[PDB]
Amino acid sequence: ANYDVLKLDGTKSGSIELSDAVFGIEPNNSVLFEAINLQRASLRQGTHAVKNRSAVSGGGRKPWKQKGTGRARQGTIRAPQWRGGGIVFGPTPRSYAYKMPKKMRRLALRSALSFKAQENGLTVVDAFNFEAPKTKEFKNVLSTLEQPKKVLVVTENEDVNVELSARNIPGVQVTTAQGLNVLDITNADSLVITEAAAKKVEEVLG
Amino acid sequence: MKLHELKPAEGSRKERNRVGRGVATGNGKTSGRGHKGQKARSGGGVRPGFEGGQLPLFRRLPKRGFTNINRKEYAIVNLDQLNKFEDGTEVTPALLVESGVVKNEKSGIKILGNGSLDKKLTVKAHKFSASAAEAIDAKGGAHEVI
Amino acid sequence: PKMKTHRGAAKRVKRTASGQLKRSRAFTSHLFANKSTKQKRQLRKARLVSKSDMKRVKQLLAYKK
Amino acid sequence: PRVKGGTVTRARRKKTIKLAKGYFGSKHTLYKVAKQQVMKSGQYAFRDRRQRKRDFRKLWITRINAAARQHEMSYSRLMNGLKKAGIDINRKMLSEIAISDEKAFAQLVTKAKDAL
RNA sequence: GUAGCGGCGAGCGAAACGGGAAGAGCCCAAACCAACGUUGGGGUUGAGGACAGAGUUACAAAGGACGACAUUAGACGAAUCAUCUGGAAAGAUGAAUCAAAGAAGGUAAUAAUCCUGUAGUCGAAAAUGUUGUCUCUCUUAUCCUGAGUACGACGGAGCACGUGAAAUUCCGUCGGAAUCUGGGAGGACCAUCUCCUAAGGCUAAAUACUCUCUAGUGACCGAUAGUGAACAGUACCGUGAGGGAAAGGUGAAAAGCACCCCGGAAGGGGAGUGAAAUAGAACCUGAAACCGUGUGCUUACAAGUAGUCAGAGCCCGUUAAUGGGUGAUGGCGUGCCUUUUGUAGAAUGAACCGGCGAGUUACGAUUUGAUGCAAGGUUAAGCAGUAAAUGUGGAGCCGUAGCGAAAGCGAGUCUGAAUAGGGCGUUUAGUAUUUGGUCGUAGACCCGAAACCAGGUGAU
RNA sequence: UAACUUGGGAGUCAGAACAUGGGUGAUAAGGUCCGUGUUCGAAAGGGAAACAGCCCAGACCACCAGCUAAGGUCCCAAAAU
RNA sequence: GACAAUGGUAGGAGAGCGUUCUAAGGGCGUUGAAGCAUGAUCGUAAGGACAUGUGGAGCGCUUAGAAGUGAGAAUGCCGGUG
Ligand SMILES: [K+]
Ligand SMILES: [K+]
Ligand SMILES: [Mg+2]
Ligand SMILES: [Mg+2]
Ligand SMILES: [Mg+2]
Ligand SMILES: [Mg+2]
Ligand SMILES: [Mg+2]
Ligand SMILES: [Mg+2]
Ligand SMILES: [Mg+2]
Ligand SMILES: [Mg+2]
Ligand SMILES: [Mg+2]
Ligand SMILES: [Mg+2]
Ligand SMILES: [Mg+2]
Ligand SMILES: [Mg+2]
Ligand SMILES: [Mg+2]
Ligand SMILES: [Mg+2]
Ligand SMILES: [Mg+2]
Ligand SMILES: [Mg+2]
Ligand SMILES: [Mg+2]
Ligand SMILES: [Mg+2]
Ligand SMILES: [Mg+2]
Ligand SMILES: [Mg+2]
Ligand SMILES: [Mg+2]
Ligand SMILES: [Mg+2]
Ligand SMILES: [Mg+2]
Ligand SMILES: [Mg+2]
Ligand SMILES: [Mg+2]
Ligand SMILES: [Mg+2]
Ligand SMILES: [Mg+2]
Ligand SMILES: [Mg+2]
Ligand SMILES: [Mg+2]
Ligand SMILES: [Mg+2]
Ligand SMILES: [Mg+2]
Ligand SMILES: [Mg+2]
Ligand SMILES: [Mg+2]
Ligand SMILES: [Mg+2]
Ligand SMILES: [Mg+2]
Ligand SMILES: [Mg+2]
Ligand SMILES: [Mg+2]
Ligand SMILES: [Mg+2]
Ligand SMILES: [Mg+2]
Ligand SMILES: [Mg+2]
Ligand SMILES: [Mg+2]
Ligand SMILES: [Mg+2]
Ligand SMILES: [Mg+2]
Ligand SMILES: [Mg+2]
Ligand SMILES: [Mg+2]
Ligand SMILES: [Mg+2]
Ligand SMILES: [Mg+2]
Incomplete structure (x- = not known):
């Protein structure tokens, strides 16, 4: 419910009230698993194909007469049992993405955020004061905030200087309030969120 | 949870059966098809409803009736559904769709007499059953065909 | 693609509330002199598709509901 | 993704061939005939684990019969006498005593004769 | 998968409404004027006409001036040293540094700081394109309104629609209207009403495709795979149309073995190079079948699916286990698969070894498990977004009520003269996504005909 | 100790011998067609020399323990010259 | 702890082994990965280790996900060799 609000130097600037309905619920592991699986499946490019017996080059004619040669009967040199033949079934291009009810999506987002709020993996900063992109200064800020390797940085909107400062540090990822997703949140060990971003997240996830 | 500790919900997932992969599965060789006959073949089996040449049921039975091109079907509201609104409220098709009682309007809105009303309302609809009209009028309210 | 309804069957049955199929009766076209009065009277009455x-x-x- | 045949086939077939060690000619070399023999070997071993109990009881009875005839008695009479006397020494022990300690077997025979 | 079409069989199968992408409107013929029927003016429609700022994307067609942007070469571009093992360091250890750059390749093993690069930024003599401002021109009911037409008969065809009660559209043959008080359509047809105005033409965009080009992507292949083709439509086959392969890998670096010896050579043994030559080119790894050399045990009186159980003798000594190899001799014992009432079967199949080789996916249906919400549940296309999650989108779909062929009535309804009896119903649970099972449409588990049709090639 | 109802998923529609009640044939067939039961099919183990269908009897695995079934006890070959 | 059950073809049901790829986590590797070879090792099975030799650069494990996922027979196809 009540959360400390820190400066970039670690000083405890103030306090914020975060809706228990967003950061305070008991995570639904079933729905969270379904959402992670769904997002991972949506990331798939199903560009995989093989040539079946119709698609293989040539192979129109009968290799030899049906009877009298003493050999097994055959119909085309591109049959699947032939070396160089067509493939039986095999991959064919298709999308792996599927949908889930919107209420389930929201429950998944709330479950991930509440798991972060539990286990003391959430921290709120007062603001980000990056006027120019400086990776070393952002790394210093993270070190002062005493954060683990994997951090998800959440801003209210697209903050270009914060994004440019952070995008080269391994394990650090930056998103906006609207960009929050289960894969990103669960992969991170800690969330560093601005006060305005946290307020917006509460406003939209209710 | 964690990406290295994912767990599907209990009973939510079952491994698919793979036939034709050895005797010990119990679906090797004939792959559950038994031995020979039309049903053992790839693409084999007669069309559904086929009875092997005996006259099919849907040929031995006669056709019946016709479809009315001008058929009207109404969205129906019962009195127990009308309970949702407070006393003195004027009920209209727009109000019903807004409050969500009626999802699709169809040829109109008909009030029906299942359930108990227990409220005084002015109900404006396209059709009323006799019992629905009587109950609306006898609970202190009024109805109008619009 | 979508499965196709069997159009003759759809012309011959109707779906009841519990999911049963109401059907008409065979032997109701002609040759009514060869059938008793009780036979025709009871053939007038509809039945259900058997299990x-x-x-x-x-x-x-x-698709027929 | 494609799954090649790989190494599992060779490993399994090699296990069968190793089990076929000492078999004659192609039966210790070629996987198909080795597999057939190993299957037969298992069936034979199951059957013979059963038959060996009968075989050894047969041997013990033969030896007990010889010892009893030495003491002027048949096997059937000796066993009936032992049962009547209440002696429950089994046939393996009886044959082993008859081989090792002739005097103790003579005492057992005397008890059997007394019970009859 | 509705309405409908259909030996009403198998099957075939809309459209309007609603929600979206995109969006654009115009020019003639004729009435009538002025010039020599042909030209210019006139005009463009649901009642109108006669009479009385726009443009080279249709709407008319040619140029220029200049700008800007893009493509077709390129340039700059941060930051690492030491020790150890090693042939070699990027690896290990220590201590540093850069990052709008921790994409990716290469470098003697695995590098953000060694190289090529990457983030970022800059760049064009010339040529093609896109797009702007100025210019530039173009411009400011008396009469008519599409005739061998519409339409009809016959024969066909296209319409989801098989001639049907068959409207609507088209072709051949033959007939053949009317003229705003006109003409056509609203599924035979008539009347009324409603909507529209055929028999002239033009018109971008949202849509379809990929031999190509540029930049990229993949829970796609990795040399029997992936293109037929990593080295080829070649070799080879055929008169011809046409068919159509096999075949990748030394090493970091050629340092690719000077020299000596046997040998005509081939090939070897040394010596050298190399970390390694059983990495020496037929070159990484080097399985199995198969072929040899040596020998620990055994075998020349013995009748056999070759093993198995028992078991001395001899020889060894382990993942140390009540061990390993061999085996005199005794008991038992007619391979496997398929197909069969029944197969040792003298029924089928396999020479052996190796690789390859068969229930898959998409869209629907149904059922079960799981999960979310619940008298509600849920969006589709689209739009935004990173080819994502997701947000938005409520059109639509399934439920909340059934009964009847239907009009209809409704917790009832149908039948029935019935207030009877009887059928189906009422006397709460659904819905969305998804794992599994099964079915349908697709070649639908794989291989196999004899044949059929179409277009070609052949009388050497 | 089952039985029935409702749903999901099947396979089967060539059977064979033996015994017994019958048809047919010829009180022929290891014939053929029905009734009844068992076994084989889909069942190994013991017996019937060998021998799916006969007799005894239904193998979760191990034992160099014991009692029995059918069938057996002179030798092959366990048990009565 | 004391009772019961466990022959099986077509076939139904359940639980698992192993293969390739992916995600996340945690590791191994020139002081020698995968592969190959040998062994007297382990588990109820599919199968899993360890040691040595060869090899010379990649590869396990955990959880979950996805499949071109397992061959002895097709007078199967290709290659090699009897
Ligand atoms: K003119
Ligand atoms: K006609
Ligand atoms: Mg083809
Ligand atoms: Mg089975
Ligand atoms: Mg098989
Ligand atoms: Mg078969
Ligand atoms: Mg059959
Ligand atoms: Mg069948
Ligand atoms: Mg087929
Ligand atoms: Mg691969
Ligand atoms: Mg294979
Ligand atoms: Mg016994
Ligand atoms: Mg540099
Ligand atoms: Mg007309
Ligand atoms: Mg006109
Ligand atoms: Mg290879
Ligand atoms: Mg190839
Ligand atoms: Mg291919
Ligand atoms: Mg070597
Ligand atoms: Mg080699
Ligand atoms: Mg001899
Ligand atoms: Mg002799
Ligand atoms: Mg024998
Ligand atoms: Mg036969
Ligand atoms: Mg023979
Ligand atoms: Mg045959
Ligand atoms: Mg053969
Ligand atoms: Mg083979
Ligand atoms: Mg199928
Ligand atoms: Mg399926
Ligand atoms: Mg079925
Ligand atoms: Mg017979
Ligand atoms: Mg007889
Ligand atoms: Mg009988
Ligand atoms: Mg059978
Ligand atoms: Mg038997
Ligand atoms: Mg039985
Ligand atoms: Mg006999
Ligand atoms: Mg016997
Ligand atoms: Mg048998
Ligand atoms: Mg006894
Ligand atoms: Mg004897
Ligand atoms: Mg048993
Ligand atoms: Mg069993
Ligand atoms: Mg099953
Ligand atoms: Mg399983
Ligand atoms: Mg597994
Ligand atoms: Mg396969
Ligand atoms: Mg073969």
Whole structure:
């Protein structure tokens, strides 16, 4: 419910009230698993194909007469049992993405955020004061905030200087309030969120 | 949870059966098809409803009736559904769709007499059953065909 | 693609509330002199598709509700 | 993704061939005939684990019969006498005593004769 | 998968409404004027006409001036040293540094700081394109309104629609209107009403495709795979149309073995190079079948699916286990698969070894498990977004009520003269996504005909 | 100790011998067609020399323990010259 | 702890082994990965280790996900060799 609000130097600037309905619920592991699986499946490019017996080059004619040669009967040199033949079934291009009810999506987002709020993996900063992109200064800020390797940085909107400062540090990822997703949140060990971003997240996830 | 500790919900997932992969599965060789006959073949089996040449049921039975091109079907509201609104409220098709009682309007809105009303309302609809009209009028309210 | 309804069957049955199929009766076209009065009177009354036939033909009327 | 045949086939077939060690000619070399023999070997071993109990009881009875005839008695009479006397020494022990300690077997025979 | 079409069989199968992408409107013929029927003016429609700022994307067609942007070469571009093992360091250890750059390749093993690069930024003599401002021109009911037409008969065809009660559209043959008080359509047809105005033409965009080009992507292949083709439509086959392969890998670096010896050579043994030559080119790894050399045990009186159980003798000594190899001799014992009432079967199949080789996916249906919400549940296309999650989108779909062929009535309804009896119903649970099972449409588990049709090639 | 109802998923529609009640044939067939039961099919183990269908009897695995079934006890070959 | 059950073809049901790829986590590797070879090792099975030799650069494990996922027979196809 009540959360400390820190400066970039670690000083405890103030306090914020975060809706228990967003950061305070008991995570639904079933729905969270379904959402992670769904997002991972949506990331798939199903560009995989093989040539079946119709698609293989040539192979129109009968290799030899049906009877009298003493050999097994055959119909085309591109049959699947032939070396160089067509493939039986095999991959064919298709999308792996599927949908889930919107209420389930929201429950998944709330479950991930509440798991972060539990286990003391959430921290709120007062603001980000990056006027120019400086990776070393952002790394210093993270070190002062005493954060683990994997951090998800959440801003209210697209903050270009914060994004440019952070995008080269391994394990650090930056998103906006609207960009929050289960894969990103669960992969991170800690969330560093601005006060305005946290307020917006509460406003939209209710 | 964690990406290295994912767990599907209990009973939510079952491994698919793979036939034709050895005797010990119990679906090797004939792959559950038994031995020979039309049903053992790839693409084999007669069309559904086929009875092997005996006259099919849907040929031995006669056709019946016709479809009315001008058929009207109404969205129906019962009195127990009308309970949702407070006393003195004027009920209209727009109000019903807004409050969500009626999802699709169809040829109109008909009030029906299942359930108990227990409220005084002015109900404006396209059709009323006799019992629905009587109950609306006898609970202190009024109805109008619009 | 979408499964296709069996149009003759759809012309011959109707779906009841519990999911049964109401059907008309055979032997109701002609030759009524060869059938008793009670026979014709009771053939006037509709029946349901039997359970075994339903096992055979359910998918033909899946869309018919 | 494609799954090649790989190494599992060779590993399994090699296990069968190693089990076929000492078999004659192609039966210790070629996987198909080795597999057939190993299957037969298992069936034979199951059957013979059963038959060996009968075989050894047969041997013990033969030896007990010889010892009893030495003491002027048949096997059937000796066993009936032992049962009547209440002696439950089994046939393996009886044959082993008859081989090792002739005097103790003579005492057992005397008890059997007394019971009859 | 509705309405409908259909030996009403198998099957075939809309459209309007609603929600979206995109969006654009115009020019003639004729009435009538002025010039020599042909030209210019006139005009463009649901009642109008006669009479009384726009543009080279249709709407008319040619140029220029200049700008800007893009493509077709390129340039700059941060930051690492030491020790150890090693042939070699990027690896290990220590201590540093850069990052709008921790994409990716290469470098003697695995590098953000060694190289090529990457983030970022800059760049064009010339040529093609896109797009702007100025210019530039173009411009400011008396009469008519599409005739061998519409339409009809016959024969066909296209319409989801098989001639049907068959409207609507088209072709051949033959007939053949009317003229705003006109003409056509609203599924035979008539009347009324409603909507529209055929028999002239033009018109971008949202849509379809990929031999190509540029930049990229993949829970796609990795040399029997992936293109037929990593080295080829070649070799080879055929008169011809046409068919159509096999075949990748030394090493970091050629340092690719000077020299000596046997040998005509081939090939070897040394010596050298190399970390390694059983990495020496037929070159990484080097399985199995198969072929040899040596020998620990055994075998020349013995009748056999070759093993198995028992078991001395001899020889060894382990993942140390009540061990390993061999085996005199005794008991038992007619391979496997398929197909069969029944197969040792003298029924089928396999020479052996190796690789390859068969229930898959998409869209629907149904059922079960799981999960979310619940008298509600849920969006589709689209739009935004990173080819994502997701947000938005409520059109639509399934439920909340059934009964009847239907009009209809409704917790009832149908039948019935019935207030009877009887059928189906009422006397709460659904819905969305998804794992599994099964079915349908697709070649639908794989291989196999004899044949059929179409277009070609052949009388050497 | 089952039985029935409702749903999901099947396979089967070539059967064979033996015994017994019958048809047919010829009180022929290891014939053929029905009734009844068992076994084989889909069942190994013991017996019937060998021998799916006969007799005894239904193998979760191990034992160099014991009692029995059918069938057996002179030798092959366990048990009565 | 004391009772019961466990022959099986077509076939139904359940639980698992192993293969390739992916995600996340945690590791191994020139002080020698995968592969190959040998062994007297382990588990109820599919199968899993360890040691040595060869090899010379990649590869396990955990959880979950996805499949071109397992061959002895097709007078199967290709290659090699009897
Ligand atoms: K003119
Ligand atoms: K006609
Ligand atoms: Mg083809
Ligand atoms: Mg089975
Ligand atoms: Mg098989
Ligand atoms: Mg078969
Ligand atoms: Mg059959
Ligand atoms: Mg069958
Ligand atoms: Mg087929
Ligand atoms: Mg691969
Ligand atoms: Mg294979
Ligand atoms: Mg016994
Ligand atoms: Mg540099
Ligand atoms: Mg007309
Ligand atoms: Mg006109
Ligand atoms: Mg290879
Ligand atoms: Mg190839
Ligand atoms: Mg291919
Ligand atoms: Mg070597
Ligand atoms: Mg080699
Ligand atoms: Mg001899
Ligand atoms: Mg002799
Ligand atoms: Mg024998
Ligand atoms: Mg036969
Ligand atoms: Mg023979
Ligand atoms: Mg045959
Ligand atoms: Mg053969
Ligand atoms: Mg083979
Ligand atoms: Mg199928
Ligand atoms: Mg399926
Ligand atoms: Mg079925
Ligand atoms: Mg017979
Ligand atoms: Mg007889
Ligand atoms: Mg009988
Ligand atoms: Mg059978
Ligand atoms: Mg038997
Ligand atoms: Mg039985
Ligand atoms: Mg006999
Ligand atoms: Mg016997
Ligand atoms: Mg048998
Ligand atoms: Mg006894
Ligand atoms: Mg004897
Ligand atoms: Mg048993
Ligand atoms: Mg069993
Ligand atoms: Mg199953
Ligand atoms: Mg399983
Ligand atoms: Mg597994
Ligand atoms: Mg396969
Ligand atoms: Mg073969």
